[PDB]
Design a protein around this nucleic acid. Sequence first.
RNA 1: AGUAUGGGAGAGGAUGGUAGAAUUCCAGGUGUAGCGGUGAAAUGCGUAGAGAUCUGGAGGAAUACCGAUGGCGAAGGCAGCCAUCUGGCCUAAUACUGACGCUGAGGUACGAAAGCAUGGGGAGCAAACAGGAUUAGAUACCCUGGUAGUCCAUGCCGUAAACGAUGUCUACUAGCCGUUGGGGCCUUUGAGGCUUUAGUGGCGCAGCUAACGCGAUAAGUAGACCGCCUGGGGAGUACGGUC
Lengths: 52, 117, 62, 88, 104
Amino acid sequence: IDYKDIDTLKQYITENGKIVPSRITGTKARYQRQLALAIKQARYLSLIPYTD
Amino acid sequence: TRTVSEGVAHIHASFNNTIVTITDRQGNALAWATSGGQGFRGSRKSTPFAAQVAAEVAGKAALDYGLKNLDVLVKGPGPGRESAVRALGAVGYKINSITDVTPIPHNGCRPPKKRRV
Amino acid sequence: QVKLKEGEPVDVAIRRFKRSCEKAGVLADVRKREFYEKPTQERKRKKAAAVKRYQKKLARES
Amino acid sequence: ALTNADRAEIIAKFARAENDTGSPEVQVALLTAQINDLQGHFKAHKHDHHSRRGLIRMVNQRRKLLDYLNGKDHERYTALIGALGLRR
Amino acid sequence: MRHYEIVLLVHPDQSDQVVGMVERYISQIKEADGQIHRLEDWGRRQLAYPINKIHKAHYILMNVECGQSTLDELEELFRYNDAIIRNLIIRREHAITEESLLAK
RNA sequence: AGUAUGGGAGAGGAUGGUAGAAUUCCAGGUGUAGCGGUGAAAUGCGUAGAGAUCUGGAGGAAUACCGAUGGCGAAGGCAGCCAUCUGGCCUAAUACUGACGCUGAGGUACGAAAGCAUGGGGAGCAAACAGGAUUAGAUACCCUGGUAGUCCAUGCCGUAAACGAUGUCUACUAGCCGUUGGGGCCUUUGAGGCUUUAGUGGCGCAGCUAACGCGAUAAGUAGACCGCCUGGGGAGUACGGUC
């Protein structure tokens, strides 16, 4: 996964903009780590908002 | 004198007080009231009843400027947020949307020490 | 961002917003920001929380 | 950092047989090259203690291999230290 | 040599210059050495949050293979050019050539 | 025990850039009598205009969510993102050397926080200190302020309940349930199920223990080397010496 898959990334973001925990979503640990990295890169690139 | 139809209410509700400020959009104040301004001195400033009283006064004051629909923002973990937001509907405005705007640091400054009461 | 539709009452709006804020959990962060928690205390509290979580999981399994 | 080509040339130069990679001569040559390369890194970053531990481990391993080779065959030890320019 | 992926955000008032700047960078890469595996122009995009009181931007993606000196010159050019407001440079192992999302 | 070749995970280390939230201050609009704080108050701030709200600017420090009985490191410790330099570990199969090993008195390297030296920086917090309360008294706990310091560069200091209160290395001895990084097999189309390996957790047979308890991550059964103890105080003290 990568930061350009914004449609996939929105699937793991709440309405406020916070990352959804793995205990709630049902994710593998390594996949979750890659997700967090990609999401933090997307926020910097201003593809998705930081908060709200 | 100035007339405006759409306004914003700000409820700053701390653990010691509650300030209800009514402004227009772009944040120019029109009317405000606090629990201290209606007696309720000392610790009684934090009761929900005082928040309701202040909200009623603020809404009636803004009715002179003539607002009918407004957007409400509540910040602070006060005990009077619900009473303050309820009193506006009793006064007679239309609450288009009401939200929470409390600030949260992203691990910034160091808070003060813990009280050993 | 609780935006009311055409005809809910003020009390319904208030209760729905309260539920939304309870889900959001901003007040927990605001309470945590009141005083400084030392790293020792934070680690102790998180260890206790983990122990309680593992105890709850076995009970729910049985 | 040394790459595969440099390591291959070192192995080819100091090999004692065909497909020989475990000989003490080859091992000591590789360790010497690695230490000499890391000297430049430690010139710039004076406070990299965590990497300096690995450097010290390399030094100790080279010393132990040299002692074993000296105990086994003295002429090979002298030839190797002469070729690498080690003082002892 | 190493493979890098660069993403640039360009001020829309200076979007008429994006072709010029991109061919300048690619050329400099060529006389250095370089292999442009990919160039994509995502186009005009709304920013999620305003940057420097700007709300639209031009999005450019490049995949290059360069050396340290060429990378330093690229970084300094990006820093000094006023049209480029933000840039992200990521090292990757492998050359990426396939068409990516957002290229629509 | 070690070496070469493929692959993998990681807050491991050093250097330099950069992003968003928030606090303080400053400038300017809207606006007018309170704000702040407590168990209750008061000191304090404000009509030369606060607090609240909106816009812009400056500066310092720390990195929400992810986050986990998770991960990495010899220990001390290490969390935003990016680049550069760099150490160790896991994993498969051949190939190579041929006991090259374990421990280690003296010695030497690293070593939280506080503290010291020289030069910078200083938002927030805050020893010392000042005032307001409480009290028989308050020297304290509570409140309003606040200097060292906390931060950076270059050095010193060498101490902690520096703890798993459990030195390092090796082999063997019922089982059951989790979790992290890999290998293999099986279905059968993609998500599961069996094994094996290196870590990290919860129970528990035998065995051990004064008891509590430990129990393949032993405090069990054995071997190698080192450190340490010999009633409580006086005392980690005096003298001498080294730093």
